[PDB]
Amino acid sequence: NWLFGKKRKEDADALATLKGQQNRLQAEARNLERQSDEQKILASKMLKAGNK
Amino acid sequence: GEKIKTVSPERTERVMDSVMEQRDQIEMMTEALSDPSLSEGILDFEDDAAIDEQL
Amino acid sequence: MVKNWLFGKKRKEDADALATLKGQQNRLQAEARNLERQSDEQKILASKMLKAGNKAGARQALKRRAVFMKRLNTVHNTAMNLQAQIDSIQTATSTAETVKAMELGTKVVGEKIKTVSPERTERVMDSVMEQRDQIEMMTEALSDPSLSEGILDFEDDAAIDEQLAQLEAE
Numbered sequence: 001n002w003l004f005g006k007k008r009k010e011d012a013d014a015l016a017t018l019k020g021q022q023n024r025l026q027a028e029a030r031n032l033e034r035q036s037d038e039q040k041i042l043a044s045k046m047l048k049a050g051n052k
Numbered sequence: 053g054e055k056i057k058t059v060s061p062e063r064t065e066r067v068m069d070s071v072m073e074q075r076d077q078i079e080m081m082t083e084a085l086s087d088p089s090l091s092e093g094i095l096d097f098e099d100d101a102a103i104d105e106q107l
Numbered sequence: 108m109v110k111n112w113l114f115g116k117k118r119k120e121d122a123d124a125l126a127t128l129k130g131q132q133n134r135l136q137a138e139a140r141n142l143e144r145q146s147d148e149q150k151i152l153a154s155k156m157l158k159a160g161n162k163a164g165a166r167q168a169l170k171r172r173a174v175f176m177k178r179l180n181t182v183h184n185t186a187m188n189l190q191a192q193i194d195s196i197q198t199a200t201s202t203a204e205t206v207k208a209m210e211l212g213t214k215v216v217g218e219k220i221k222t223v224s225p226e227r228t229e230r231v232m233d234s235v236m237e238q239r240d241q242i243e244m245m246t247e248a249l250s251d252p253s254l255s256e257g258i259l260d261f262e263d264d265a266a267i268d269e270q271l272a273q274l275e276a277e
Binding site: 001002003006 | 076083
């Protein structure tokens with residue numbers, strides 16, 4: 001009876017937790033990619049400016 | 053420290069998880085046995101119309 | 108009559124630890140009382156230095172009193188910390204007993220749930236439903252009105268219709 005709704009709620013909560021954690025990981029990956037692109041452009045710029 | 057090592061928090065988590073699971077299983081077993089579809093059994097084909105008029 | 112050897116051993120150890128903590132707490136309370144007495148004496152002395160016409164001595168006595176009250180505060184806080192440790196010991200003991208009781212109950216209910224599983228209850232209820240259906244079909248087969256009726260009107264109730272009409276007119 002009422003246990004079926006509880007099971008559905010538990011599955012939905014577990015999926016919500018997993019998706020939220022995946023959202024944090026995707027945000028961190030986006031930040032890392034931003035930093036890597038910035039770093040590549042900076043390296044090209046300072047090689048233009050003459051340092052190895 | 054000796055007490056905390058004996059009854060660790062992981063042990064309490066296991067005990068409470070077992071209590072929750074067993075409570076769920078007792079509820080499901082005791083609601084399976086109480087399904088009104090048996091004592092009802094045969095239901096109105098007219099879908100309560102005769103009992104409506106009786107009331 | 109089961110002896111719990113380890114339980115009694117640990118009980119003696121915890122009782123000795125509680126006795127040690129209570130004794131040190133009592134010592135700290137006595138020291139706090141003595142420091143309060145000394146502070147009161149210093150305040151009386153400060154009052155006498157004020158009356159006699161010696162403000163420097165009054166300031167001296169009040170500084171000494173301030174040191175005594177700071178020591179009193181430190182002693183009182185230490186005694187409160189010892190009380191907190193005693194409460195932690197008693198809370199850990201109670202929590203251990205609660206977890207043991209819960210584990211015992213869980214063991215019993217687990218044995219019951221394994222014996223009468225939910226699949227077993229599903230099988231029993233399915234058998235009850237099937238047998239109820241078969242009893243209903245058997246007991247309605249035997250009650251078909253076509254027998255006691257048997258021969259039905261070829262005119263299809265016309266004669267009985269007119270008989271009912273004639274009895275109504277009667």
